[PDB]
Amino acid sequence: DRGVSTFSPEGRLFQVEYSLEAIKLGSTAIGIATKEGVVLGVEKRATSPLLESDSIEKIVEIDRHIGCAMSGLTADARSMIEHARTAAVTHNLYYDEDINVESLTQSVCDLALRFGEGASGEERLMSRPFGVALLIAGHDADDGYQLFHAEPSGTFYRYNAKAIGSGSEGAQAELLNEWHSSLTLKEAELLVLKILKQVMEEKLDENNAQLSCITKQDGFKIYDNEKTAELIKELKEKEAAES
Amino acid sequence: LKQTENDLKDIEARIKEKAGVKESDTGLAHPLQVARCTKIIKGEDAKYVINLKQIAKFVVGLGERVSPTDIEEGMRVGVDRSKYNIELPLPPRIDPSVTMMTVEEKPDVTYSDVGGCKDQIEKLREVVELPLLSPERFATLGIDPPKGILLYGPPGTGKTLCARAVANRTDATFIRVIGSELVQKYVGEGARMVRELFEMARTKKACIIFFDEIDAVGGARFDDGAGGDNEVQRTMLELITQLDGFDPRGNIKVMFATNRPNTLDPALLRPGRIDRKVEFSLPDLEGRANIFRIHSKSMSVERGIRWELISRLCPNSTGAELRSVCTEAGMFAIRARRKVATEKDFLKAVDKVISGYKKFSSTSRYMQYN
Amino acid sequence: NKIETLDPALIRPGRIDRKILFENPDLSTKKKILGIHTSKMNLSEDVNLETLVTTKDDLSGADIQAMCTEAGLLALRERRMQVTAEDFKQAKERVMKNKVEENLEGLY
Amino acid sequence: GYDRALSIFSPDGHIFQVEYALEAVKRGTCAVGVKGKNCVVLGCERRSTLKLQDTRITPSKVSKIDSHVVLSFSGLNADSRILIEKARVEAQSHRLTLEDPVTVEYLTRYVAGVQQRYTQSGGVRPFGVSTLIAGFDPRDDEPKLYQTEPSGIYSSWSAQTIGRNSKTVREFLEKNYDRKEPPATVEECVKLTVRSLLEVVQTGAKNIEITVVKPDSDIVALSSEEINQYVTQIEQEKQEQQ
Amino acid sequence: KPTETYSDVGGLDKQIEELVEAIVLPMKRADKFKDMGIRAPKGALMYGPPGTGKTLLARACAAQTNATFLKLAAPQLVQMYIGEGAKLVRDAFALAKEKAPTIIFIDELDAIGTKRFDSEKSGDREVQRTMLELLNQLDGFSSDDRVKVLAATNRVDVLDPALLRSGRLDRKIEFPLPSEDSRAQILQIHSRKMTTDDDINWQELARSTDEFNGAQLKAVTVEAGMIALRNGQSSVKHEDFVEGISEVQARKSKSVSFYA
């Protein structure tokens, strides 16, 4: 085509504005940070009936007291393993404590978005800014639970309840009235699975999705297939008792 | 044997038709190329005799008085060559000469893509339909409806389908002229001959003409052409002449078609021959949900089908690309022999058509600005 | 030959939907192509038509049309409706050594 | 050198580099594999018809990382061997540091990690290499199968195969072959593998090669005589009309 | 006498000040020119987008000088035959010389003006003869007030050194980028028929506009009332003129991501 330095008629890059199309091609995930814990989850779906969901990780862990997720291509998800996970350990290497979620996100965004045509000192060799939507959540030692997100455009915003993926248009619309300040951990476990039911194209299964949580004491803990199936049975019993 | 007995009353009425010919019986025996009569026997100055042909070229400086008492001799007197006006005795003037004109009736096209065209069609309605409803708001406010408008995007994905659908509800004269055949050879065949259509547009009202294939007309130049495209570029400038000195915008509309907006001459794209531009791109998801309804209005579908999960498999697309999903879905009922259209046919078609069949060969990076 | 670059200026989404590409025939397809060509053809009863079908490189119905004509003109010189076995392999070489050429891409 | 990037991000997500990197496997030979209990079997084929060479003198898909880990795939030839030597040095890098053999999970990440810099960073173009990675873990007999995409996407599989018309061939193993009930005897994995190899190469068994990965540093390569033993059993009950 | 006058145009008073000394003055008083032997040219050259000048400018000169207006388009000069329009060069000048004072206008000079120096000029031989017959015959057809040659187009991509002479084209007019006060006077022309609320500040709207010629400034006043059409307002206001920028011309529309 032409030089990457070409902007939009509004003065923005093309790869930044077009980075939202690669997110819809990924998996739909909705994070929620309640008063008790922070609800994390994704959607594995299926690429085949012989697909194994045990060895695939769509939800990673940067540090014990925090968590992370991904929606998009899995290539950029490992770029923060050498950056976000390194910066979290670098903080413990210097200040030896839990990094603030508010400061960590902006610190990651410095290591997250770097690109361009070329530069001697900094590495601009990266072409596409992001191919994945990364979620950033955890607990702050001062404020509290904070749910942030790494956007494919590179910016960052404070999200009380965040929805990403292809179904983020219809899920976030109803999410306004669903999220409340009184929403607890147990009440938010059946709420996410109920929203993902209208999202997921197939029957809810332990291998078609993965959920986890962020605890201020035990830390990031994944939900095992035996435990995930329990939340599935609780959803079928809850939906039948609504009417 | 209808025509056999129809001439019985017609031959008897032929003399009655000859009674009108009995006015001028000289020289043996309204569209015209050039005004031509025989000697103009009928005809300061009193009688007026002017003819332009290979023999006896005539010119008269005066006029505007009654010599002939309306039609005379060869019946053809009036506008030709321009420069020449016989008005006062009921003229057959400003009439289409020998030429090639495409004129059809009732270009019926239904709705195609309403997804992003909600307020986008309203801009098209403000072009034609608006002055045909409340013209009083133009003189009071001091504003005029848009004349020129540009169509850019992929080749007929529901953009062009919307252009022909709105024209059917205008209930006016529809004329289609393209730019590919417009080239030809002789200078003026693509400009002066089409200028006659532009001049007739001011004569005959309630006319709507869509200019087609502007890529074969306009375009940007650097070395100022390799030759042969000058008349192609002069036709672009001839379109400016009709909009240059004077022109009413009430009965005359201008609409282009192309695949990219800025590929024309950057001086051509300048405003005043285009008041508004049609921005055509890939609309949102829930907006195109009516497209699945339009194709299913006349289509038998099994009750209980869920369109929410079907739209999730389909990424951002256009109106025509959604019909291709239902087109192959109709073929699923041919081979596999399905009674009606089921949910499994639609869920598989998206992966069969878009993912499976479509693959390469689509317009993606070919539009930025230029 | 290749309509790839040619295709999405014309085809449009849904006016014309067809995609058909040249496919390498398998053991079953090569038998029906070569066997039916011999319905009206006569040749030596001691030669099997499936002998050269097992090991062969990309010979379609167009390649067989010449191998039948080239081997036929050699046997017609002696005025005989049957073609010997030597003309079968002789006609396959000159067709394979001319129009049939690969990219020399192995393994992969 | 080259300061710019050899790749361009797509407006709709359709990337020229991702396009023809997958079809590089579609142009090349198929790589068939299936897991098991105590072992894993990886089959393959050859595109060349006339064979003037021997299987031992010319290696094709045969490559080794750990002692008990045999890694066989087809995405390409030249660009494929580059990632193998880097993986062997990386496999030694764990012996120079961790002193223990690396699990198959990271061996897939390292191959995709080099492919990660190709799709992300500029100055170098990505490959069309797609690796099917197998082998065991230290003091573990359970095999693993990971399908590595050139874009850096990997997932766990069982009967998955990549190559020419491999999506249709895999559908044969989606029903008769049960992932929940894997076979026991080593030869049982070969019976289902040979039947899947006849749907692509058909005749010309000289091109058919079978590599069985066994623990305790053992590799068994089946010959053409043992393959024909299962070919006869295919036409026994199939041709009979019940 | 068209309605376009010096009041209906703006920002051209710098070129009009130099235009009077070209056309208008020798049309009447030749006394001061014959004493110094200065032969004034028959016209000038201008290029730019319409609505700021050109067409509306050339017609306004016929109303002030009160002369016959004769307009012949440039693409109409080139014809299919040999020298069909080239023979009309002396014909157009013979009619202009004998009958009444007039100013000959050329619409879209690029039609006969796309040549440059390349070897494709031999494709149309009637084009160059029309230009050469135009330049060399100005001295033989001179010594009257009844013939004036004026040319105009949208843009001039062809630089001809032979067009500079006292009798040939004098002024080369390129429409400059209108400034704050320059765009204000242009908007005052199209707002004469507009009914406003008198809440508009002229210096306020011009600061938000940058490099917008009169062709783009005209679309602001036209699309301003269209915003009030859906609102049912009786007259436009100061916000409606800002909404004219919100109308989609220069790609001012909205998008996703960074702002929502």
Chains with 3 or more CB pairs under 8 A to chain D: A, B, C
Chain breaks in chain B (C to N over 2.5 A) after: 29, 43
> Which residues in chain C have Cβ-Cβ distances shorter than 8 Å to B155?
9-10, 12
Return the residue in B352, B364, B367, B368 with the most chain D beta carbons within 10 A, the one to mutate for interface testing: B364
Q: Is B360–C13 a contact, with Cβ atoms under 8 angstroms apart?
A: no
Q: At which residue do the structure tokens 């319409």 appear? A: E50
The technique is: cryo-EM
The answer for residues whose C-beta is within 8 angstroms of residue B361's C-beta and 6 or more apart is C4, C7, C8, C11
At A55, the amino acid letter reads: S
Q: Is E255–A17 a contact, with Cβ atoms under 8 angstroms apart?
A: yes
> How close does chain C come to B99, measured CA to CA in Å?
29
Give the integer Cα–Cα distance in Å for B103 and B310.
42
Residue B26: CB atoms within 10 Å: 12
> How close does chain C come to B275, measured CA to CA in Å?
28
What DSSP line would sit under B218-268, residue for residue?
----SSS-SSS-HHHHHHHHHHHHHTTS---SSS--EE--BS-GGGS-TTT
**Backbone CA torsion sign across B346, B349, B351, B354:** negative
Residue of E150, E108, E191 whose CA lies nearest to E19:
E150
User: Does B327 appear as a known binding residue?
Assistant: no
Q: Domain map of chain A by residue range?
A: 1-242
Contact B81, B153 (CB under 8 A): no
Give the integer Cα–Cα distance in Å for A223 and A210.
7
Contact D181, D37 (CB under 8 A): no
**Biggest distance spanned by C-alpha atoms of chain C:** 58
Strand partners, B174: B104, B208
Identify the closest residue of chain B to E158 by CA–CA distance: B224
Q: Where are the alpha helices (DSSP H) in chain B?
A: 2-21, 118-125, 136-141, 159-168, 192-203, 230-242, 289-297, 307-313, 319-335, 343-350
Chains with 3 or more CB pairs under 8 A to chain B: A, C, D, E
The answer for residues whose C-beta is within 8 angstroms of residue E203's C-beta and 6 or more apart is E180, E181, E184
User: Does B156 appear as a known binding residue?
Assistant: yes
Q: Is C8–B157 a contact, with Cβ atoms under 8 angstroms apart?
A: no
CA B331 to chain centre: 35
**Backbone CA torsion sign across E204, E207, E208, E213:** positive
SS3 sequence of A171-229: HHHHHHHHCCCCCCHHHHHHHHHHHHHHHCCCCCCCCCEEEEEEECCCEEEECCHHHHH
Q: Give the nearest partner residue to A153 out of E250, E251, E257, using CB atoms.
A: E257
Give the integer Cα–Cα distance in Å for E51 and E45.
16
Give the integer Cα–Cα distance in Å for A220 and A68.
9
The CATH code that applies to domain A1-242 is 3.60.20.10
Question: For chain C, what's the residue count?
Answer: 108
DSSP state for residue E167 in the 8-state scheme: S
SS3 B306: coil
User: Does E1 appear as a known binding residue?
Assistant: no
**Backbone CA torsion sign across D191, D194, D198, D200:** positive
Residue of A79, A103, A81 whose CA lies nearest to A91:
A103
Contact A229, A210 (CB under 8 A): no
Contact B115, B127 (CB under 8 A): no
DSSP state for residue E232 in the 8-state scheme: T
The answer for residues whose C-beta is within 8 angstroms of residue B337's C-beta and 6 or more apart is none
What DSSP line would sit under A92-142, residue for residue?
HHHT-SPPPHHHHHHHHHHHH---SS--SSS-----SS-SEEEEEEEE-SS
The answer for residues whose C-beta is within 8 angstroms of residue D68's C-beta and 6 or more apart is D135, D136, D213, D214, D215, D216, D217, D218
Q: Which two tokens stand for residue B57?
A: 């070229």
Q: Is E256–A20 a contact, with Cβ atoms under 8 angstroms apart?
A: yes
At B230, the amino acid letter reads: N
**Backbone CA torsion sign across C94, C96, C99, C101:** negative
Give the integer Cα–Cα distance in Å for E214 and E194.
17
Please report the number of interchain residue pairs, chain B to chain E, with beta-carbon separation below 8 angstroms.
125
Give the integer Cα–Cα distance in Å for A113 and A13.
13
DSSP state for residue C6 in the 8-state scheme: T
Residue of D145, D157, B159 whose CA lies nearest to A50:
D157
Residue of B310, B308, B339 whose CA lies nearest to B326:
B310
Identify the closest residue of chain B to D13 by CA–CA distance: B364
> Which residues in chain C have Cβ-Cβ distances shorter than 8 Å to D48?
106-107
Contact E123, E80 (CB under 8 A): no
Q: Euclidean distance between the first and final Cα of chain E, in Å?
A: 53
Contact D134, D176 (CB under 8 A): no
**Backbone CA torsion sign across D194, D200, D203, D206:** negative
Q: Which two tokens stand for residue D34?
A: 């299936």
SS3 B356: helix
Expressed in Å, this structure's resolution amounts to 6.3
**For residue E184, what are the CA distances in angstroms to A37, E173, E202, E217?**
61, 21, 6, 9
What Rg value do the Cα atoms of chain D yield, rounded? 19
Contact A165, A29 (CB under 8 A): yes
The answer for residues whose C-beta is within 8 angstroms of residue A45's C-beta and 6 or more apart is A27, A200, A201, A202, A208, A209
Q: Which two tokens stand for residue B157?
A: 């994905």
**For residue B239, what are the CA distances in angstroms to B190, B196, B244, D43, E249?**
11, 12, 9, 69, 21
| Partner E contacted by A11 (CB < 8 A) | no
Q: Is D12–B316 a contact, with Cβ atoms under 8 angstroms apart?
A: yes
Contact A214, A43 (CB under 8 A): no
Give the integer Cα–Cα distance in Å for E17 and E23.
11
Contact C54, C14 (CB under 8 A): no
Contact C24, C63 (CB under 8 A): no
> Which residues in chain D have Cβ-Cβ distances shorter than 8 Å to A117?
3-5
Burial of B139 (0-12, 13-18, 19+ CB in 10 A): exposed
> Which residues in chain B have Cβ-Cβ distances shorter than 8 Å to E216?
271
Contact B350, B314 (CB under 8 A): yes
Rounded (10°) angle between helices B319-335 and B343-350: 120
> How close does chain C come to B213, measured CA to CA in Å?
13
Q: Which two tokens stand for residue C36?
A: 């039916």
SS3 E172: strand
What DSSP line would sit under chain D, residue for residue?
---S-S----SSS--HHHHHHHHHHHHS--EEEE--SS-EEEEE--S-SS--S-TTTS-SS--BSSSS-B----S-SHHHHHHHHHHHHHHHHHHTTT-SPPPHHHHHHHHHHHHHHHHHSSSS-------EE---BTTB-----EEE-TTS-EEE-SS--BSTTHHHHHHHHTTSS-SSS---SHHHHHHHHHHHHTTTT-S-GGG-EEEEEETTTEEEEE-HHHHHHHHHTHHHHHSS--
Contact A3, A117 (CB under 8 A): yes
Q: Is D10–B365 a contact, with Cβ atoms under 8 angstroms apart?
A: yes
Give the integer Cα–Cα distance in Å for D149 and E235.
63
Q: Domain count of chain D?
A: 1
Identify the closest residue of chain C to D26 by CA–CA distance: C108
Q: Is A201–B286 a contact, with Cβ atoms under 8 angstroms apart?
A: no
Give the integer Cα–Cα distance in Å for E70 and A75.
71
> Which residues in chain A have Cβ-Cβ distances shorter than 8 Å to E249?
none
Give the integer Cα–Cα distance in Å for E39 and E50.
30
Residue of B232, B215, B254, B255 whose CA lies nearest to B366:
B215
Q: Give the nearest partner residue to D7 out of A51, A56, A127, using CB atoms.
A: A127
SS3 A146: strand
Q: E135: number of CA atoms within 13 Å, CB side?
A: 13
Identify the closest residue of chain B to A197 by CA–CA distance: B309
Q: Backbone phi, then psi, for B258, in 5-degree steps? A: -165, 175
Q: Which two tokens stand for residue B2?
A: 């209808």
User: Does B160 appear as a known binding residue?
Assistant: yes
Q: Is B320–C11 a contact, with Cβ atoms under 8 angstroms apart?
A: no
Return the residue in C12, C20, C21 with the most chain B beta carbons within 10 A, the one to mutate for interface testing: C12
| Partner E contacted by A155 (CB < 8 A) | yes
> Which residues in chain B have Cβ-Cβ distances shorter than 8 Å to E116?
223-224
Q: A91: number of CA atoms within 13 Å, CB side?
A: 16
Q: Across the beta sheet with E102-107, what order do the strands follow?
A: E68-73, E102-107, E149-153, E45-47, E172-174
Strands A29-33 and A38-43: antiparallel
Give the integer Cα–Cα distance in Å for A76 and A26.
13
Q: Backbone phi, then psi, for E7, in 5-degree steps? A: -75, -30
Give the integer Cα–Cα distance in Å for B127 and E219.
15
At A225, the amino acid letter reads: N
Give the integer Cα–Cα distance in Å for D96 and D110.
16
DSSP state for residue A52 in the 8-state scheme: B
User: Does E53 appear as a known binding residue?
Assistant: yes
Give the integer Cα–Cα distance in Å for B359 and D19.
9
Residue of E243, E237, E235, E191 whose CA lies nearest to B137:
E235
The answer for residues whose C-beta is within 8 angstroms of residue E235's C-beta and 6 or more apart is B141, E195, E196, E197, E228
Q: At which residue do the structure tokens 């961790």 appear? A: D98
Q: Which two tokens stand for residue A153?
A: 């455009």
Return the residue in B358, B365, B367, B368 with the most chain D beta carbons within 10 A, the one to mutate for interface testing: B365
User: Does E48 appear as a known binding residue?
Assistant: yes
Q: Where are the alpha helices (DSSP H) in C1-108?
A: 27-37, 51-54, 61-76, 86-96
Determine the structural domain holding residue D17 and report its residue range: 1-240
CA D228 to chain centre: 23
CATH number of the CATH domain containing D225:
3.60.20.10
The answer for residues whose C-beta is within 8 angstroms of residue D172's C-beta and 6 or more apart is D195, D196, D199
Residue of C89, C103, C102, C21 whose CA lies nearest to C58:
C102
Contact D176, D192 (CB under 8 A): yes
Q: Across the beta sheet with B207-211, what order do the strands follow?
A: B103-104, B173-177, B207-211
Rounded (10°) angle between helices A225-240 and A185-199: 80
Q: Across the beta sheet with A209-215, what order do the strands follow?
A: A161-164, A29-33, A38-43, A209-215, A219-222
Give the integer Cα–Cα distance in Å for B231 and B237.
9
Q: Is E225–B141 a contact, with Cβ atoms under 8 angstroms apart?
A: yes
Q: Is D11–B365 a contact, with Cβ atoms under 8 angstroms apart?
A: yes
Return the residue in D35, D120, D125 with the most chain A beta carbons within 10 A, the one to mutate for interface testing: D120
Q: Is B312–A6 a contact, with Cβ atoms under 8 angstroms apart?
A: no
Give the integer Cα–Cα distance in Å for C82 and C76.
8
Give the integer Cα–Cα distance in Å for D82 and E208.
58
Give the integer Cα–Cα distance in Å for E216 and E50.
10
Contact D55, D42 (CB under 8 A): no
Give the integer Cα–Cα distance in Å for A238 and E53.
75
User: Does B18 appear as a known binding residue?
Assistant: no
Residue A164: CB atoms within 10 Å: 30
At A51, the amino acid letter reads: L
Give the integer Cα–Cα distance in Å for B147 and D53.
76
The answer for residues whose C-beta is within 8 angstroms of residue D1's C-beta and 6 or more apart is D123
**Backbone CA torsion sign across C81, C84, C90, C92:** positive
Contact D133, D111 (CB under 8 A): yes
Residue B210: CB atoms within 10 Å: 21
Contact E75, E108 (CB under 8 A): yes
| Partner C contacted by D53 (CB < 8 A) | no
> Which residues in chain B have Cβ-Cβ distances shorter than 8 Å to E152?
none
Q: Backbone phi, then psi, for D191, in 5-degree steps? A: -60, -40
Give the integer Cα–Cα distance in Å for B52 and B59.
9
User: Does E167 appear as a known binding residue?
Assistant: no
D197 in the Ramachandran plot: left (φ > 0), alpha (ψ -120 to 50) or beta?
alpha
Strand partners, B176: B210
Q: Euclidean distance between the first and final Cα of chain D, in Å?
A: 71
Residue of E84, E72, E63 whose CA lies nearest to E5:
E63
> How close does chain B come to E177, measured CA to CA in Å?
15
Q: Is D46–C107 a contact, with Cβ atoms under 8 angstroms apart?
A: yes
Do B and E touch, counting CB pairs below 8 Å (3 needed)? yes
